[PDB]
């Protein structure tokens, strides 16, 4: 568990997503952006920081990671659809390294979801920012390693589905 | 007729396209990319460098410019849909300034269309490259000024249509 993300790791993830999306003819960037937000809320719903009525709020770790991996899926798809070049990659690592406001205590505050919504309805939300958000969550609440593992598992199953196996 | 393109001119064009596309709910990046290529061939068909059987090949200048403006329309739309940032703009002006192979005699060769097709079926064709192509054609065969004029005229009519006037 390095809990770090390398250039080669990111490039591999983008390549994995690309191979799967190439098999989706109706691929629609506007729809992918909406799916990103919907999947984000589903992940947020597994964290359960607003569910005061629960004895043990928070779903099992493997469930939370699986729902987080959905956010990553659409984040990678959106990046690929917009053309993720070497200079986009550099800006991503700079933005990721120097993000100051997405740390553990902030992400554990249930009011964080209002800030996220303020980003989500802005036309100018970048594909880079969407990726920074999902990797900071992994880095801060989980590990980047488990997120990558859950996503790769999911995509293997996804290829089996589209293969009819 | 400066036959040049400034940063402010490009930003204005992108803003014009953005306002119009915001009124198109079914906006689909994959469809816009195909439309770019189809409109490209329509413009090429007005140049008529392959129509050996004509006495006066080439349609009137205003027709050629109008069809070129269609290429620009989809080129701007694709750029906007992919998120055209300040660094994309800088790379565009560098690519445009230092393009060596899209000059007048090349563009007047009817075999140029095979090279274009080799670019058009490549998944990795960038929105920047699509814009470099259309502005070099304007610069070399027409002027950038007439292209901008034809596009602005077209978009004014387009807003009148979507306004129901
Ligand atoms: Ca989900
Ligand atoms: Ca891009
Ligand atoms: Ca046309
Ligand atoms: Ca972009
Ligand atoms: Cl309740
Ligand atoms: Cl004939
Ligand atoms: Mg650094
Ligand atoms: Mg220069």
Residue numbers in the entry:
A (entry chain D), B (entry chain D): 1 to 165
What does the original paper state about this entry?
As we previously indicated, Ala73 is placed at the bottom of the nucleotide binding pocket occupying the position responsible for deoxyribose discrimination, thus its substitution for a bulky hydrophobic residue (Leu) should abolish nucleotide access. In vitro characterization confirmed that the ϕDI A73L mutant (ϕDIA73L) presented a null dUTP-binding capacity when it was checked by ITC and, consequently, was inactive as dUTPase. Remarkably, and in support of our hypothesis, ϕDIA73L did not induce SaPIbov1 and presented a clear reduction in its capacity to interact with Stl, as confirmed in vitro by Native-PAGE assay. Superimposition with wild-type ϕDI structures, both apo and dUPNPP forms, confirms an identical folding (RMSD < 0.5 Å) and rules out any conformational impact of the A73L mutation. However, the C-terminal helix α8 presents a higher stabilization compared not only with the apo form but also with the nucleotide complex, allowing us to model all the residues except the last four. In this way, the A73L mutation seems to mimic the nucleotide stabilizing of motif V in the trimeric Duts. However, the structural characterization of the ϕDI Dut A73L mutant has shown that this mutation promotes a compact conformation that could be stabilizing the dimer, supporting our proposition.
SaPIs are clinically relevant pathogenicity islands, residing passively in the host chromosome under control of the SaPI master repressor, Stl. Some Staphylococcus aureus phages encode dimeric instead of trimeric Duts, which are completely unrelated at both sequence and structural levels. Remarkably for unrelated proteins, our results indicate the de-repression mechanism used by dimeric and trimeric Duts is conceptually identical, involving dUTP as a second messenger turning off Stl-Dut interaction.
